[PDB]
Structure 1
């Protein structure tokens, strides 16, 4: 057995869903993640063209937990503006977690408005629930949402 946990974040953004989705689905996004989020990375290696199936090997500078993990783009759905990115090696998988999936859904609210609905689902062995609970937060998805919003809006 494992236990399933799901955590959620929303950001309202004063830009269209189309504009926001342009950035989340840009095939160059992975390779530019260090520009988008400066000072995070020690190393970033990308296998793939940025579309579905791309693997990102991410190593973070000392003092960051986790230190390294591999991520894979599982879904990049233009019709529903839905992105799924799986932690496939390392990271929380070395802390009793057997499944880790980030979902990002860009939902239109108005002509020039949308909500970025980010969530994390993980499956954890029961004896590890207490250990991973404070470590797995929406922090990284909220950081990405904040930075994408700012990149679209700010002049």
Structure 2
């Protein structure tokens, strides 16, 4: 059955700057901040927001060589974005279901809380969450 893993991190960045890169401007950023993992990101379908489909192409040494993700939730007013893996990635490594939901909140002008919810069924969320948190901290440094 689908289980959940929740974690969070506070980043030293403005909410709106983090929201823009997280939710919309990530296509050139992911390969720049995860160059050991992601070769490029392709927009497959959609124009942003719900129903958008993405391909993440990994480095040649990586198997599976890609992951297909879909934006399943998008809410500007609450700064929430959810992405479901629909092909490849962790689904090729024993997961039957995998979704990541990010929610941003303002703590102070230059401090933003990121809540991370991973929904999964069957590679553990303890480990996969570390990768997701590393990505978030990399967005903080990109923006700083």
Decide: shared fold, TM above 0.5. Answer: yes
Alpha carbons of 1:134 and 1:65: their partners in 2 closer, same or farther (altered >3 Å)? Answer: farther
Provide the rounded CA distance (Å) in 2 between the counterparts of 1:134 and 1:75.
20
- What is the TM-score with the length of structure 1 in the denominator? 0.76
Per the TM alignment, residue 121 of structure 1 is displaced from its structure 2 partner at its CA by: 1.1
Corresponding residue to 1:133 among 124, 128, 134: 124
Provide the rounded CA distance (Å) in 2 between the counterparts of 1:135 and 1:111.
30
Computing the radius of gyration over CA atoms, which structure comes out larger, 1 or 2?
A: 1
Match of 1:148 in 2: 139
The one-character-per-residue Cα deviations of 1:27-68 (angstroms, maximum 9, x if unpaired) are x31344212322323453321333332211223224445432
Match of 1:105 in 2: 103
Could you list the structure 1 runs, at least 4 aligned residues long, displaced by more than 3 angstroms after superposition.
Answer: 62-67
Match of 1:127 in 2: none
Match of 1:129 in 2: none
Indicate if the aligned counterparts of 1:58 and 1:69 stay in contact, CA closer than 8 A.
yes
Match of 2:57 in 1: 59
Provide the rounded CA distance (Å) in 2 between the counterparts of 1:116 and 1:100.
19
Indicate if the aligned counterparts of 1:30 and 1:50 stay in contact, CA closer than 8 A.
no
Structure 1 residue runs of 5 or longer lacking an equivalent are: 125-131
- What is the TM-score with the length of structure 2 in the denominator? 0.81
Alignment of 1:15-34 (within 5 A): 15-26=13-24, 28-34=25-31
Aligned length: 143
CA RMSD of aligned residues (A): 2.4
Structure 2 residue runs of 5 or longer lacking an equivalent are: none
Indicate if the aligned counterparts of 1:100 and 1:123 stay in contact, CA closer than 8 A.
yes
Match of 1:14 in 2: 12
